[PDB]
Amino acid sequence: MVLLMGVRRCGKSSICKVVFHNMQPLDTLYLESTSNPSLEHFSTLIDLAVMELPGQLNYFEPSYDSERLFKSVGALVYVIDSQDEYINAITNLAMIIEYAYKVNPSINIEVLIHKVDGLSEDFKVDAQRDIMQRTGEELLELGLDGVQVSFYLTSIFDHSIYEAFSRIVQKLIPELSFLENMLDNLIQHSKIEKAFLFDVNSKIYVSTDSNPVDIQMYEVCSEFIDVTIDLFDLYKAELQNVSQLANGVIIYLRQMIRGLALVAIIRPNGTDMESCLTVADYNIDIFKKGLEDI
Amino acid sequence: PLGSKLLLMGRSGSGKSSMRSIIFSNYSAFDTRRLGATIDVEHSHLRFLGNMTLNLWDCGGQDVFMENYFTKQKDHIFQMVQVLIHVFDVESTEVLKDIEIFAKALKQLRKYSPDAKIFVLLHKMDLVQLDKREELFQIMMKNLSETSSEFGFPNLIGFPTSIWDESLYKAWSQIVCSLIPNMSNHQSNLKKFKEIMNALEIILFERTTFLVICSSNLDPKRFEKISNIMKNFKQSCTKLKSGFKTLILNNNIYVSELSSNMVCFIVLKDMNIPQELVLENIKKAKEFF
Numbered sequence: 143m144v145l146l147m148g149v150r151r152c153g154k155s156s157i158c159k160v161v162f163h164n165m166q167p168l169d170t171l172y173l174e175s176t177s178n179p180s181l182e183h184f185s186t187l188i189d190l191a192v193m194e195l196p197g198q199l200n201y202f203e204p205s206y207d208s209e210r211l212f213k214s215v216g217a218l219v220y221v222i223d224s225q226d227e228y229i230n231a232i233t234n235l236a237m238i239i240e241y242a243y244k245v246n247p248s249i250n251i252e253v254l255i256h257k258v259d260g261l262s263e264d265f266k267v268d269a270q271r272d273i274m275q276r277t278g279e280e281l282l283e284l285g286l287d288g289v290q291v292s293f294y295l296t297s298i299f300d301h302s303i304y305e306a307f308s309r310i311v312q313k314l315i316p317e318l319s320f321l322e323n324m325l326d327n328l329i330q331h332s333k334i335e336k337a338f339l340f341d342v343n344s345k346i347y348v349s350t351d352s353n354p355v356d357i358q359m360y361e362v363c364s365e366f367i368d369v370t371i372d373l374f375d376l377y378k379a380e381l382q383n384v385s386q387l388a389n390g391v392i393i394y395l396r397q398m399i400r401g402l403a404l405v406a407i408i409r410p411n412g413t414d415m416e417s418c419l420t421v422a423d424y425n426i427d428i429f430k431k432g433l434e435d436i
Numbered sequence: 437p438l439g440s441k442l443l444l445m446g447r448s449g450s451g452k453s454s455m456r457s458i459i460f461s462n463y464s465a466f467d468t469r470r471l472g473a474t475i476d477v478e479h480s481h482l483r484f485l486g487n488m489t490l491n492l493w494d495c496g497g498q499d500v501f502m503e504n505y506f507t508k509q510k511d512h513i514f515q516m517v518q519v520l521i522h523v524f525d526v527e528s529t530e531v532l533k534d535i536e537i538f539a540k541a542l543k544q545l546r547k548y549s550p551d552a553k554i555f556v557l558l559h560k561m562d563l564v565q566l567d568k569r570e571e572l573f574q575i576m577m578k579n580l581s582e583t584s585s586e587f588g589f590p591n592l593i594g595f596p597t598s599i600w601d602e603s604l605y606k607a608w609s610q611i612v613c614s615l616i617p618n619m620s621n622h623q624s625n626l627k628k629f630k631e632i633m634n635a636l637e638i639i640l641f642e643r644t645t646f647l648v649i650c651s652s653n654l655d656p657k658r659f660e661k662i663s664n665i666m667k668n669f670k671q672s673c674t675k676l677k678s679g680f681k682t683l684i685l686n687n688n689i690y691v692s693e694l695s696s697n698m699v700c701f702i703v704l705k706d707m708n709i710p711q712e713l714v715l716e717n718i719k720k721a722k723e724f725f
């Protein structure tokens with residue numbers, strides 16, 4: 143279970159709908175205020191629950207109903223605005239993870255430096271690489287320095303809400319290591335150079351190669367899901383799409399088990415297309431078996 | 437002959453530059469906000485279908501510039517026009533002043549270029565709710581169609597247009613096509629190409645802007661949405677530093693370059709013929725046929 147929290151108006155519910163309901167980013171600039179702890183469920187199979195506690199109660203805040211819930215929590219997603227209020231939310235977090243770490247030691251603390259819209263690219267390094275300092279300093283007080291901390295650059299209009307939610311939702315996965323391995327080299331007995339599993343209705347990369355990503359490769363593939371899905375939907379009467387660029391780079395998407403989909407960048411270095419596709423297709427059929435076994 | 441003057445006139449803020457940027461400058465709708473005001477005419481010599489040069493006169497719409505176009509520069513702005521494309525902000529505060537300048541223009545077209553093609557676009561339509569859109573259009577057109585029929589023009593053609601949907605593509609496809617000389621040919625070769633493939637349908641798209649050139653024959657807005665989807669994808673392939681060349685979807689849809697100036701969107705009747713046979717045919721086809 144992912145637990146989404148912050149302080150009112152930050153971005154905890156706009157991204158809760160912009161991602162799982164597959165909503166538009168516009169229709170959230172005037173959304174209301176979800177006080178009730180709403181437990182939604184989106185299925186990346188096995189199903190992943192997402193609650194989103196209302197962002198207040200003066201420094202959460204030890205109780206039978208603060209320990210009850212973190213016992214079932216898998217990772218704590220602390221969203222954190224950046225139109226303002228940069229400083230208090232930090233201490234909020236510090237405490238919130240202080241009690242959290244003695245209820246669940248296996249808990250992963252994930253913080254979103256959210257709302258990073260039109261705000262320069264040197265302004266960003268500013269907020270991040272030292273906001274982390276602000277969070278380590280309060281962790282140098284009543285606590286300890288060594289902790290699971292991770293810092294992303296969500297933007298609900300960017301692609302990176304999805305990249306962040308992926309690197310996150312990917313750690314709460316039963317055998318991330320063998321999915322990644324079996325899609326790593328197990329698909330480097332071919333011309334494929336980058337692979338992504340993908341929920342299609344969302345767009346979080348449920349996994350990727352052991353090659354650290356680069357968002358560029360993430361966008362193409364996701365965007366390619368769109369181009370395939372929108373074109374298909376124009377004429378309804380495998381679910382796969384091959385496309386080739388003028389330098390020869392192929393982009394390939396084939397369907398998997400229940401709204402999942404493989405998308406991979408194939409670099410032929412020289413070999414013809416039909417052969418790349420044949421070898422790739424062979425290993426990919428293997429991978430697909432190594433999915434249905436789950 | 438192959439060089440066309442296209443006037444893009446209309447009151448300030450109506451969104452004229454925006455359009456130019458999206459269909460011919462790969463601006464995303466968002467991107468368009470930073471476009472400044474246009475000072476007097478801003479010219480563009482765009483190159484379409486390989487040999488056709490479309491010189492877009494994007495006339496600044498502010499009143500300063502605008503009373504110019506009709507007095508001092510009248511013979512300059514209005515001589516040898518092939519196409520007026522007049523655009524109307526629908527959240528416009530002076531609808532009658534707007535139709536006024538439309539008529540001031542149509543007037544000059546009448547002495548100077550009587551043969552000019554007239555199109556109008558009801559623009560910015562995403563700022564009016566769906567239940568009221570068709571009524572806003574129909575009232576509007578009743579007015580313009582007569583304002584225009586009066587000056588030796590209409591039947592007038594107009595479009596409910598927006599930056600935030602596929603409609604811009606329908607409008608500019610219909611607009612820019614009226615300029616293709618080849619048409620008769622393209623259309624016929626397309627027919628022979630559809631017949632060969634036993635194709636459920638084949639659209640032909642100018643390659644670089646992705647306007648629909650001609651279709652071979654359910655959802656009646658398919659063509660413009662394919663221009664849109666394709667144009668997004670085209671921009672996306674930028675992330676790998678190379679140009680889209682082919683795409684095949686299922687065994688159903690095939691999209692590929694023809695000349696360095698067209699693209700063909702082929703959709704087959706079923707999904708059960710193999711690659712080989714299909715992929716052969718498209719080879720000619722091609723430039724030749």
Ligand SMILES: Nc1nc2c(ncn2[C@@H]2O[C@H](COP(=O)(O)OP(=O)(O)NP(=O)(O)O)[C@@H](O)[C@H]2O)c(=O)[nH]1
Nearest residue numbers: 150151152153154155156170171175197257297298
């Ligand atoms: N600029 C910008 N604004 C964002 C972004 N994400 C959310 N917002 C804005 O944040 C405001 C509040 O969003 P919301 O998610 O509803 O806040 P909340 O955390 O659910 N509040 P509550 O605690 O009451 O549930 C809105 O005005 C919305 O437009 C973002 O990435 N960029």
Ligand SMILES: Nc1nc2c(ncn2[C@@H]2O[C@H](COP(=O)(O)OP(=O)(O)NP(=O)(O)O)[C@@H](O)[C@H]2O)c(=O)[nH]1
Nearest residue numbers: 448449450451452453454468469474497560598599
């Ligand atoms: N909502 C909406 N905004 C639009 C649409 N088309 C353009 N815009 C916006 O409207 C504004 C008008 O800018 P612009 O396109 O330059 O209009 P213009 O006709 O060029 N002005 P001028 O004639 O003085 O140069 C921009 O903010 C642009 O983003 C549309 O269909 N819908």
Ligand SMILES: [Mg+2]
Nearest residue numbers: 154155175176
């Ligand atoms: Mg909320």
Ligand SMILES: [Mg+2]
Nearest residue numbers: 452453473474
């Ligand atoms: Mg302008």
